[PDB]
Amino acid sequence: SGFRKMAFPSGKVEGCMVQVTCGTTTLNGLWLDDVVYCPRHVICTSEDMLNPNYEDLLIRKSNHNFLVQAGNVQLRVIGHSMQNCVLKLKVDTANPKTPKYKFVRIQPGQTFSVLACYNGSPSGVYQCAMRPNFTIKGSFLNGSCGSVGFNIDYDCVSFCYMHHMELPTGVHAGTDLEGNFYGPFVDRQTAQAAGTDTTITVNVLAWLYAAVINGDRWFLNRFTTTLNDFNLVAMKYNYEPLTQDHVDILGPLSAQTGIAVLDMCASLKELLQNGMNGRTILGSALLEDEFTPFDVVRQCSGVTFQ
Amino acid sequence: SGFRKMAFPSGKVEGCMVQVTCGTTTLNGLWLDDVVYCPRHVICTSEDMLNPNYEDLLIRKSNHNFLVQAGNVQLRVIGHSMQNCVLKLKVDTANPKTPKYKFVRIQPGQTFSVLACYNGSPSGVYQCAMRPNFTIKGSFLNGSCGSVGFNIDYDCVSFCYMHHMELPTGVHAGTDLEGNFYGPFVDRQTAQAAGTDTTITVNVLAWLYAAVINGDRWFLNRFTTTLNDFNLVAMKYNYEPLTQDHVDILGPLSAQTGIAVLDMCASLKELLQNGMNGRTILGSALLEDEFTPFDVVRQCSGVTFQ
Ligand SMILES: O=Cc1ccc(N2CCN(C(=O)C3=NC(=O)NC(=O)C3)CC2)cc1Cl
Ligand SMILES: O=Cc1ccc(N2CCN(C(=O)C3=NC(=O)NC(=O)C3)CC2)cc1Cl
C-alpha cells in the first residue's frame, strides 16, 4: 500500500553526466557513445544572451575552446556541430557506461524523471509532468542547464528533456534531445511568457483510482454522467477535455476497482462543483494531476526494470 | 507587385522521392544518403490498423519484405529499424542527388511547402501553415502518405513534415522527420479529433502590411492601441494573443511602410468589430493568416536561393 511521487532509478543516467566548459561558462552535458550533448547557449557570453547569432558564435570557436570533464578524466574534443538548439561535441573516447537508449519527444500530460546536476555531478532526482503549456514545474538553480529528463522502459533509457532555461514565472523550459524546444520558446534571455496552463484531467482520474485502491472512498457516489456532460463542466474549471482514448487508457484501473470511468467522472464533477470540504485524498487537499494512468499501474501493480 | 500563395521550388526534393512497398501496401519514401524514411504504418495490414503493435509487426519482417523503387531502379534493402513513428530503411546505394539538408521541427504559425506525391512520383506543390492545433489544411488523396514538407534556406533543404494520415474533419496530421507527431495524435486508424483552431494574429498583420505595400490602404486609420487593449479584443474573436516578440518580428515591415505595428493593430481591431463591408484585401474577402512576416518580406523584397 501507499502512494508516493516516485522517480525512476537514476543509476544508468548518472554515468552519462559530464561537465562542459566553454570560456567562463560551465554547464552539464550528456555523454553517450562518443558524443556529448549540451545546450548551445554554452557558447554565449553576457554580450550575446539578449540576441545571440549562434552560427557566427560557433564558427569563431575551435575544438580546444571546449573543456569536457567526466569527473577527473578530461575528454578530448575532436569535433563539434550544432543540431537545432543542442551542441554536439564529438570526443575521442566512447562512454563505456553508455546504456541502451533512445531519443523520444513526449506529449503534454506525460511524466518523466529529472536528474538535476551541477558541474557534471548528480544532485537529486524528482518526478514531474510536461504541462499543457509545454513548461515543467521543476526545481533548478544556477548551473543546472544540461540536466536531462528520462523514462526507463525495460532496460532502455528514453531521453525526453534537456534543461535550457527558467522563465520569469519560475517555471522551466527546454528541448528534446534533437534540440527542438518544447513550446514556443527560444534560447535567448528575453522576456518570454508561457500560455495559460490547464489541469490534466485523465491524470486526475488516474489519481482518484489510486486513492480507491489505497482505501480513500469518501468521494465516490452512485451517479453516472456522459462524456459530453462531464466535458461541459470540465471546460468551466480549466480542465482538459476527456476523450474516448482517455477512457480506454483508464481501462485497467476501472477493471481493478470495478468502478466505471464515467462513474468516476461523476465523482470528479462533484469535487469540482463543491470542493473537498476540508477532507483529503491520498494526503492532499488539492486534486493532483501529475500521475499518468501508467504511473498508477506501475506503483499499484509493481513493475520493475532491468 | 502582386502577392501569391508561393511555394518553394521543389527540384531538390523531387530527386529524393521513392516508392516503398511492403506487402500489398505502397506509399512514398524519402531517400537521403543511403537511408529511406517512410511512415511506419506501411507495415500494417487491414487487421492491424485499429490497434497496431509495431514492435511485433516489425520483428516479423525481413529486409526482403520491403520493395523500394526509385523510378525504374530498384533499391536493395540491407537493413531496417524504427525511430518513433518513422521507419528507416538502409539501402545499398546512396542517393547521388542528396542535397544539403537538415531535420527541423517547426512551430505553429510557421509555413512550409508540401510536395504531394503518389507512387513515389511528385504530383504538385503547395504552401500551407502549421495550425495552432498542430494540424495542417492540406490536399491529399489515397496514396499520399510519406509526402514531405520543407523549407529552403540558402542551399539547404530543411525537412519539417512527413504526412501520415487524414483526420475525420478532413485536416491532416503527421510527424517531423525524427518520427515525432505534431500534436496529440497517434498512428492508429481510430477516431481522433483536433483541438479548436485559432487565427494566427502575427500572420494576419504581416498580410495587412503586404496589402499596404501593394496599394490596398482603405482599412487604415489614424488610431493607435496598446498591446493589452488589442489582445483583449483578439481573445474574443479566437485570435492568438500578440507578444512583444511578434511586434519585433514585424519591424522590417513597419519600417518599409512607415506604419507602426500598434497602428496596424488598431486597423485590425476595427476589421474584427465591423467586418470588411463587402470590400476585399489583396483579392480576399477574409483575413488571411497563412503568410508569415518572413514570407511577406521574401515576396515583397525578392530573396532567391542557391
Ligand atoms: O544566450 C542564451 C542564454 C544564456 C544563458 C542562459 N542561462 C544559463 C544560466 N542559467 C541557469 O543556470 C539557471 N538558473 C536558474 O535560476 N534556473 C534555471 O532553471 C537555470 C539561466 C539560463 C539562458 C540562455 Cl537562453
Ligand atoms: O495502421 C495505421 C494506419 C494505416 C493506414 C493509414 N492510412 C494510409 C492510407 N491513407 C491515405 O493514403 C490517405 N488518404 C486520404 O484520403 N487522405 C490522406 O491524407 C491520406 C489513409 C491513412 C493510416 C494509419 Cl494511422
Curated annotation (Swiss-Prot), chains A, B:
Which residues are the active-site ones?
A: 41 (for 3cl-pro activity), 145 (nucleophile)
Q: Which residues lie on this side of the membrane: Cytoplasmic?
A: 1-306
Domain Peptidase C30: residue ranges: 1-306
Tell me the compartments it is located in: Host cytoplasm; Host Golgi apparatus; Host nucleus
* Crosslink feature (Glycyl lysine isopeptide (Lys-Gly) (interchain with G-Cter in ubiquitin)) location: 5, 90
- Can you state which reaction this protein catalyses? TSAVLQ-|-SGFRK-NH2 and SGVTFQ-|-GKFKK the two peptides corresponding to the two self-cleavage sites of the SARS 3C-like proteinase are the two most reactive peptide substrates. The enzyme exhibits a strong preference for substrates containing Gln at P1 position and Leu at P2 position
Q: How does it assemble?
A: 3CL-PRO exists as monomer and homodimer. Only the homodimer shows catalytic activity. Interacts with host FBXO22; this interaction promotes the proteasomal degradation of nsp5.
Q: Which organism is it from?
A: Severe acute respiratory syndrome coronavirus 2
Purpose of the protein: Cleaves the C-terminus of replicase polyprotein at 11 sites. Recognizes substrates containing the core sequence [ILMVF]-Q-|-[SGACN]. Cleaves and inactivates human TRMT1, preventing tRNA guanine(26)-dimethylation of tRNAs. May cleave human NLRP1 in lung epithelial cells, thereby activating the NLRP1 inflammasome pathway. May cleave human GSDMD, triggering alternative GSDME-mediated epithelial cell death upon activation of the NLRP1 inflammasome, which may enhance the release interleukins 1B, 6, 16 and 18. Also able to bind an ADP-ribose-1''-phosphate (ADRP).
Question: Under what name is this protein listed?
Answer: 3C-like proteinase nsp5
Q: How is its activity regulated?
A: Inhibited by pyridone-containing alpha-ketoamides compounds 13a and 13b. In turn, alpha-ketoamide 13b (tert-butyl (1-((S)-1-(((S)-4-(benzylamino)-3,4-dioxo-1-((S)-2-oxopyrrolidin-3-yl)butan-2-yl)amino)-3-cyclopropyl-1-oxopropan-2-yl)-2-oxo-1,2-dihydropyridin-3-yl)carbamate) inhibits SARS-CoV-2 replication in human lung cells. Inhibited ex vivo by michael acceptor inhibitor N3. Inhibited ex vivo by compound 11a and 11b.
Judging by the UniProt lineage, the source's domain of life is Viruses
Effect of changing residue 132 to H: reported as: In strain: Omicron/BA.1, Omicron/BA.2, Omicron/BA.2.12.1, Omicron/BA.2.75, Omicron/BA.4, Omicron/BA.5, Omicron/BQ.1.1, Omicron/XBB.1.5, Omicron/EG.5.1
Result of changing residue 205 to V: In strain: Zeta/P.2
